[PDB]
Amino acid sequence: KKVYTTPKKIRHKHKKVKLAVLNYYKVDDEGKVAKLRKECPNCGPGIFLANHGDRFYCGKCHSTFATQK
């Protein structure tokens, strides 16, 4: 064996980031159940569309979506 070279550049993974969890669902005045954004057509409700500038995707399908809404 020889000496280890080490050209630096140490990269770490992704630690999720805990965040505020849920905000994309609302109740107006009790009775009126109100949704933010839109649900997935490929798989049933419980999945929201990820809203960008003419870019949409879902997490149960991991990525598979494209159409603007």
Partner 1 sequence: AELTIEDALKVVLRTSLVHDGLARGLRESAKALTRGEGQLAVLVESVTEEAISKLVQGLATENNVPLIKVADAKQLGEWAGLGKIDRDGNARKVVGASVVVVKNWGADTQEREILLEHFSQQ
Binding site for Zn ion (CB under 5 A): 40, 42-43, 58, 60-61
Q: Which two tokens mark 67?
A: 């159409």
Q: Does 17 bind partner 1 (CB under 8 A)?
A: no
Which of Zn ion, partner 1, none sits in contact with 61, Cβ below 5 to 8 A by type?
Zn ion
Residue 47 and residue 57 in contact, taking contact as beta carbons nearer than 8 Å: no
Q: How far is 2 from 36, CA to CA, in rounded Å?
A: 60
Site string for partner 1, 24-63 (x = CB under 8 A): -xxx--xxxxx----x----xxx-----------------
